[PDB]
C-alpha cells in the first residue's frame, strides 16, 4: 500500500468494508504481542525520530486510549510482588529486553533491573500487553471504599411536566439487584426545587422521611444516619420510595430550581466515602449559588462569535474529585440550560453528561426509549471507584496535553473519582529529545482503581511502536481515524480558548499543511494511501453538530456534541462523525453466515451522499448510537409488507420505533443485520424507521456530509479548495 492517490480522480475512495486500524511496522514476533488497538492506538504508528521531522509532517502526534473497556478475557496476576522498574516504576511488559536471563532492560528508561526471585520470559506479565494486578497494601490510601450511589432529582414544575422521574424510578426498581457491588453497597436519594429534600430510610418507621433543608445559602445534613442506607438490608425500604417518588410532586407549582445548593448538599452527604452521583436536571439553574443567566439562542444567520458562564460548577467539581466523588449529569431540558457551565461538574470529576433534548413522557417517544436504554447501560455496567491513571512513554517523548473527563494532578497524574468502561481519553505528545539511540518506543497506561467488590486492582496496557527518520515513512504509518479524533479534541479546546472560527480554521489547515508538506517532498490533489480519507473525515468534522456553522443548531446541542468528542472512544466518534450507510431493501447471502445458523448479510458501505440513495429502496444508517432506516417514496411492495408489515407507503406509522418481527425471510435477513450491528456495542442503539419524507426527521439528511448546502461546501468543492491552497 505504497501508492499515491489523486483525490480529484477517485471520488469513490471509501471502501465497502469496515476500516481496520493500521498494523505497526514491527518484527513479526513484536507485533504479535502488541496491545489491542481498541484499547490503545496512536496517530502515527511510525513514531518520528525528531521533533523537526514531526513538525515537517504537519500531523499531530498523540494517543487515544479506552483503558477500562469491557474485555472478552483478562489475565489476572496474583504474584506476591509487582515487578516494576527501579527508576521510572514502569511495570514489566512484553517489550522489555532480557539479557542475563535474570536481568531485564527497561524499555522506557533503558535501565537494567534485577529479575526478582519470582524462565521469566514465560511469565504472564511478559506475554500479555493487557493485564490486571492485585494491588498490594502500599497502593491504598485508605480501606477500599464501598460502592455508593446517590441519585439527585429535579422536581420543579417543568421537571414534573416532562415525566422523566417515572422511568428513572422504574429503571432503578428493575436494575436494583444489578447495581455493581457487594453487601457493602450504599444508596441514597435527594430531590430538589427551591429547597433540598433528603430522604431517610429506617425499618423502625412505617414510611420514609422527607427532610427539607430550606436554608439555601447554608446547606447541611439533617440526619447522621439512614440517609445513605445499606441496599440489601433496606431493599424493601428503597423499593417503596421508588414507587412513591413519582407521585409526590404532581401538583407542584415550584418553578425555580436551586441546582447549586442541591449539589453542595449532595457533596456533603458523599464527602466521607465518595462514589457516583447521578444528577437529573431539566432546566436552567436560577436560585442560589450556581445561578446561570438566560441566553438568546443563535440561528442560521448568526456569525461565529461556548465558554462557561461561571466557575462554580468547576470549583465544586474539583472538591468532588478530592473526595473520590464523581458526578454524572442527566440534562433533560427543553430550553437553554447553559450546559457550557453545567458540564464542568462532570468534566473535572471524571463523570459524563447525558443530554435528552425536549424530553417529555408523552410528546417525545424517541427520547423516552433513548433514556431507557442508556440508563440500562448506566446502571449495569462495571464500575471502578477512587481511581488514578498514569501514562508513561519512552524517554525522549513527552505528554503535553490531556483530553477527557478527569483532573490532571501534578506530575501528570490523572485523577478519576470514578472510572467507567465507556469513557475515552486522548493525549498529545512531542519529541522532547531525539530518539536517535532507539528504534522502538513504548507507551504504558496504568489504571489503579477500587473494584465494586472492594479489591484494589491495577489494569495495565502497553504499546510498542517503531521509530522512523524519513518523512515518507512517517506518512506511510498515519492512522487517519486516530488523527481525526485527536484533531477533534484539539479543535474543542481551540473553541473555548479562541473561537469557533479558529477551531474550524485549524481543522482545515491541518489538511492543507499536511498535504502541502507531502507535495513539497514528491497536477491534481496527490495524497498517500494512508491519507486518502483525511479531507473527507475532516469535512465530516466541520459539518456535524460540534463545528457546523450555518445551521439552526442550539447552544446546548453543540456543547453536548463537544462533550461527546472529549469523552467517547474513537470508534463511536467515527461512527457519529461519519455514519455507515447501507442499502437494506435487497439483502442476500454474501454475509457472515459463518456464525452457526444465522446468516448475516454484509451489504457494502456507501459514501454519505444523497446521490447514493434511491427512492426505489430503503437505506439504513448506522450513526453509532442510533439506526435510522430511510424508506423511499417508491419502495417496492415486498419491503413494505414483508419487512415493514405495511400495505403501502402511506400506512407506515408516524414515528415507528422498531420493525416488527414478521414471518418473512426478508424480515429475517434485516433483523439479522440489525442484531449484528447492535451486538458490536454497549449502548443499545435505537432504530427508528420514522425517517420518511414527511416525518420531519431530516437528521438523516444532515449526515450526508458530501453534499453541498447553502452554508457549507460539498465534498468535491472541499477537495477543490484544498488543492487551491496546496498549490498556492
Amino acid at each position: 500500500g505504497l501508492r499515491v492517490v489523486n483525490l480529484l480522480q477517485e471520488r469513490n475512495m471509501l471502501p465497502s468494508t469496515p476500516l481496520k486500524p493500521p498494523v505497526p511496522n514491527l518484527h513479526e514476533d513484536i507485533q504479535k504481542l502488541n496491545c489491542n488497538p481498541e484499547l490503545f492506538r496512536c496517530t502515527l504508528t511510525s513514531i518520528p525520530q525528531t521533533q523537526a521531522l514531526l513538525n515537517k509532517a504537519k500531523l499531530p502526534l498523540g494517543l487515544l486510549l479506552h483503558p477500562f473497556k469491557d474485555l472478552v478475557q483478562l489475565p489476572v496476576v496474583t504474584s506476591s510482588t509487582i515487578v516494576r522498574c527501579r527508576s521510572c516504576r514502569t511495570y514489566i511488559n512484553p517489550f522489555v529486553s532480557f539479557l542475563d536471563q535474570r536481568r531485564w532492560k527497561c524499555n522506557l528508561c533503558y535501565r537494567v533491573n534485577d529479575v526478582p526471585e519470582e524462565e521469566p520470559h514465560r511469565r504472564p506479565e511478559v506475554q500479555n500487553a493487557t493485564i490486571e494486578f492485585m494491588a498490594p497494601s502500599e497502593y491504598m490510601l485508605r480501606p477500599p471504599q464501598p460502592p455508593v450511589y446517590l441519585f439527585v432529582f429535579d422536581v420543579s414544575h417543568n421537571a414534573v411536566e416532562t415525566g422523566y422521574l417515572n422511568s428513572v424510578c422504574q429503571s432503578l426498581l428493575d436494575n436494583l439487584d444489578l447495581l455493581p457491588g457487594n453487601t457493602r453497597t450504599k444508596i441514597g436519594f435527594i430531590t430538589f426545587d427551591s429547597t433540598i429534600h433528603f430522604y431517610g430510610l429506617q425499618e423502625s418507621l412505617s414510611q420514609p422521611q422527607m427532610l427539607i433543608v430550606s436554608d439555601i445559602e447554608d446547606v447541611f445534613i439533617p440526619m447522621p444516619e439512614n440517609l445513605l442506607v445499606n441496599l440489601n438490608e433496606s431493599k424493601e425500604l428503597v423499593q417503596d420510595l421508588l414507587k412513591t417518588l413519582p407521585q409526590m410532586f404532581t401538583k407542584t407549582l415550584e418553578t425555580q430550581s436551586a441546582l447549586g445548593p442541591a449539589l453542595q448538599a449532595a457533596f456533603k452527604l458523599m464527602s466521607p466515602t465518595g462514589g457516583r452521583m447521578s444528577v437529573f436536571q431539566t432546566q436552567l439553574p436560577t436560585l442560589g449559588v450556581g445561578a446561570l443567566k438566560p441566553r438568546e439562542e443563535p440561528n442560521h444567520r448568526s456569525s461565529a462569535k461556548m465558554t462557561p458562564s461561571t466557575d462554580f460548577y468547576k470549583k465544586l467539581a474539583l472538591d468532588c474529585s478530592g473526595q473520590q466523588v464523581a458526578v454524572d449529569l442527566f440534562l433533560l431540558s427543553g430550553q437553554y440550560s447553559d450546559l457550557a457551565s453545567l458540564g464542568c461538574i462532570s468534566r473535572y470529576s471524571a463523570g459524563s453528561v447525558y443530554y435528552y433534548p425536549s424530553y417529555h413522557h408523552q410528546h417525545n417517544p424517541v427520547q423516552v426509549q433513548k433514556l431507557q436504554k442508556e440508563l440500562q447501560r448506566y446502571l449495569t455496567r462495571k464500575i471502578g471507584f477512587e481511581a488514578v491513571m498514569r501514562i508513561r512513554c519512552t524517554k525522549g517523548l513527552s505528554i503535553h496535553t490531556f483530553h477527557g473527563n478527569f483532573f490532571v494532578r501534578s506530575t501528570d497524574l490523572l485523577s478519576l473519582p470514578n472510572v467507567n468502561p465507556d469513557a475515552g481519553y486522548a493525549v498529545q505528545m512531542s519529541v522532547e529529545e531525539s530518539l536517535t539511540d532507539t528504534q522502538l518506543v513504548s507507551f504504558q497506561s496504568a489504571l489503579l482503581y477500587t473494584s465494586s467488590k472492594g479489591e484494589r486492582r491495577i489494569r495495565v496496557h502497553t504499546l510498542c511502536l517503531p521509530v522512523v527518520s524519513t518523512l515518507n515513512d512517517v506518512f506511510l504509518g498515519a492512522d487517519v481515524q486516530a488523527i481525526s479524533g485527536l484533531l477533534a479534541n484539539m479543535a474543542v479546546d481551540r473553541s473555548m480558548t479562541a473561537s469557533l472560527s479558529d477551531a474550524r480554521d485549524a481543522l482545515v489547515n491541518a489538511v492543507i499543511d499536511s498535504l502541502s508538506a507531502y507535495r513539497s517532498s514528491v497536477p491534481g490533489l496527490m495524497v498517500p494511501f494512508s491519507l486518502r480519507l483525511f479531507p473527507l473525515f475532516v469535512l465530516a468534522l466541520l459539518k456535524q453538530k460540534s463545528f457546523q456553522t450555518g445551521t439552526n443548531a442550539r447552544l446546548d446541542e453543540r456543547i453536548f456534541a463537544m462533550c461527546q468528542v472529549k469523552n467517547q472512544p474513537l470508534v463511536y466518534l467515527m461512527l457519529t462523525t461519519h455514519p455507515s450507510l447501507y442499502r437494506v431493501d435487497n439483502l442476500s447471502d454474501e454475509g457472515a453466515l459463518n456464525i452457526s445458523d444465522r446468516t448475516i448479510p454484509q451489504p457494502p458501505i456507501l459514501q454519505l451522499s444523497v446521490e447514493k440513495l434511491s427512492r426505489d429502496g430503503a437505506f439504513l444508517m448506522d450513526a453509532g448510537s442510533v439506526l435510522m432506516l430511510w424508506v423511499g417514496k417508491n419502495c417496492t411492495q415486498n419491503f413494505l409488507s414483508q419487512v415493514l408489515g405495511v400495505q403501502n407507503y402511506a400506512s407506515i406509522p408516524q414515528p415507528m420505533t422498531d420493525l416488527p418481527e414478521l414471518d418473512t425471510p426478508e424480515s429475517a435477513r434485516i433483523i439479522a443485520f440489525i442484531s449484528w450491528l447492535r451486538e458490536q456495542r454497549p449502548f443499545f442503539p435505537i432504530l427508528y424507521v420514522i425517517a420518511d419524507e414527511s416525518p420531519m426527521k431530516a437528521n438523516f439528511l444532515q449526515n450526508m456530509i458530501e453534499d453541498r448546502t447553502e452554508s457549507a461546501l460539498s465534498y468535491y468543492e472541499f477537495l477543490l479548495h484544498i488543492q487551491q491552497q496546496v498549490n498556492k
Binding site: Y139, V388, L413
Partner: peptide, 4 residues
C-alpha cells in the same frame, strides 16, 4: 501523590 501516588506510586502508580
Amino acid at each position: 501523590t501516588s506510586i502508580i
